[PDB]
Amino acid sequence: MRTRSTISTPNGITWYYEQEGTGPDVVLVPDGLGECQMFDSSVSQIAAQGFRVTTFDMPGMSRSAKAPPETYTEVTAQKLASYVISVLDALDIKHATVWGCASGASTVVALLLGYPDRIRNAMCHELPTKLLDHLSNTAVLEDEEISKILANVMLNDVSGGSEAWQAMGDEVHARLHKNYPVWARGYPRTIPPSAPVKDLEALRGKPLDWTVGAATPTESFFDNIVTATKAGVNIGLLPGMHFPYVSHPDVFAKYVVETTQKHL
Amino acid sequence: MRTRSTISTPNGITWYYEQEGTGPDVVLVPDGLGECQMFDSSVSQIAAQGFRVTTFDMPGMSRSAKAPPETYTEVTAQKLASYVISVLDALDIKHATVWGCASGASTVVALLLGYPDRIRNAMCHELPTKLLDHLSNTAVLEDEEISKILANVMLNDVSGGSEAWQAMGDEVHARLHKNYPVWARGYPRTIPPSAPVKDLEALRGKPLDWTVGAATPTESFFDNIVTATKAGVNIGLLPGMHFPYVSHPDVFAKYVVETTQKHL
Ligand SMILES: C[C@H]1CCC[C@@H](O)CCC/C=C/c2cc(O)cc(O)c2C(=O)O1
Ligand SMILES: C[C@H]1CCC[C@@H](O)CCC/C=C/c2cc(O)cc(O)c2C(=O)O1
Helix, strand or coil, X not given: CCEEEEEEECCCEEEEEEEXXXXXXXXXXXXXXXXXXXXXXXXXXXXXXXXXXXXXXXXXXXXXXXXXXXXXXXXXXXXHHHHHHHHHHHCXXXXXXXXXXXXXXXXXXXXXXXXXXXXXXXXXXXXXXXXXXXXXXXXXXXXXXXXXXXXXXXXXXXXXXXXXXXXXXXXXXXXXXXXXXXXXXXCCCCCCCCXXXXXXXXXXXXXXXXEEECCCEHHHHHHHHHHHHHCCCEEEEECCCCCHHHHCHHHHHHXXXXXXXXXX | CCEEEEEECCCCCEEEEEEECCCCXXXXXXXXXXXXXXXXXXXXXXXXXXXXXXXXXXXXXXXXXXXXXXXXXXXXHHHHHHHHHHHHXXXXXXXXXXXXXXXXHHHHHHHHHHCCCCEEEEEEECCCCCCCHHHHHHHHXXXXXXXXXXXXXXXXXXXXXXXXXXXCCHHHHHHHHHHHHHHHHHCCCCCHHHCCCCCHHHHCCCCEEEEEECCCEHHHXXXXXXXXXXXXXXXXXXXXXXXXXXXXXXXXXXXXXXXXXXXX
8 A cells, every 4th residue: 555645844845755565664766857656666566575665756846846946956966865864854764775866866875975874775876977968958948848858858768668658657747748847957957066976985885786777878877887886886787778667667676675685 | 002912821811901001000900790991991090190000801701711710710819819910920010009899809908918018009999708698699590691680780780870881882791791600600609708808907007998889788898897997997988889980980090099199
């Protein structure tokens, strides 16, 4: 049985969140698009091994759109880690395993470095460290231009699984549609320079497990692989590209549970 | 003015080879397909910056097909390094900068480790260290079935640039056609276990520059990036996939000259 509800935190944000299961806490942090329905079937699968799985739309996105502007403009890993700690405080989640891709990847690493007593272990996927002009440039476009371009980039290029991406269904793509412009304006200029992965030696020894997409072109996250290896941090592959929890939910969920079990 | 000629080495191989320019020696070793026409426009570009550029079809391939069977069956980095040393002996090339992709990548690092006095510096691209069963399994297919499959894999998937691949023209594709089966039967089962990168500390400090394709899916040469980083070896990207000297000849040739200049 899945809890679907809202909860507020004193930084002005009213989070849509979901939660299933009983056990050690595992938290699934969304990617830049902030849409936690992406995790839907994995939440059930992780929870069915023995875990409490919690997830939530991110601030200004989808059903957590009721939030102040500092919360989705000039976004940084450190700001997002703060937000996620706040919703963990509110849900009384004291010690959490965390997953995150993209801006969520930067969030979970910032979580791990910033709040080490809170984080049992952190799985980051495809941590954006480099400014990409094709993304940054969309921000100056009109909202509806942005949705069209980005919806298409996800559908045809980088879902890692187009049928799975389509099958999320119309409600989700209608929420995504509204999120594309707030993401485009809030994330790509300021998320990469905030990458909390320039201090190699802070990563060393930490309980951190890094993945990249198997089918993702090598240039996108080449740098993650270099950085992990310099720092001794476990690094490997999941199938797909940026959304393995959409395209390969079974392999995704198995990986989250195995990795969490490694750290109980 | 380009020398196009043959020369014979005492291991039974008659090499087709080409050579242009005057300067320090730079040697372009083909990938598994053994076809040196792939380097055509680069040979002129590299040479025009004050190098003597040499290249050749590989044994049992294209115009270097007159060779004994040991030279293109159960092929290995160490065997290939031997073969190229032999043709460098014959052409009286005493010190050489070397490039190689794929089996050529393995060859040039075996060269570097095995004949250090001979190798000024080695650029290796996409060094195959893993057995792939989809490749190994083509070997039992009918020659002509292997050509069709493999011609099509290069054209549609892994060229890194279809137009450029097509533009090489009919003569080269007709030589490739014959090479695909010799390659499939000779290389994929035995080239990877011969990977001369299991001794990390032999690589350390050597004058080696490693690249992978930018557009190449991350899983194919993930392991190169890990291995280079562990060994302090310089590692970066070129555009395209397995054949940057076909798809991006300009950036290929610039990279070979810049990198060679770093080592005079
Ligand atoms: C929203 C996803 C879209 C993936 C598109 C994907 O194809 C582009 C992948 C590289 C960029 C991801 C990205 C980069 C940033 O600077 C900030 C981010 O929040 C992301 C990120 O979350 O990417
Ligand atoms: C000729 C190309 C095949 C291109 C398909 C290419 O996409 C196949 C995947 C990469 C591996 C290539 C490879 C592997 C080996 O064990 C030995 C080899 O000589 C190669 C190699 O030369 O690769």
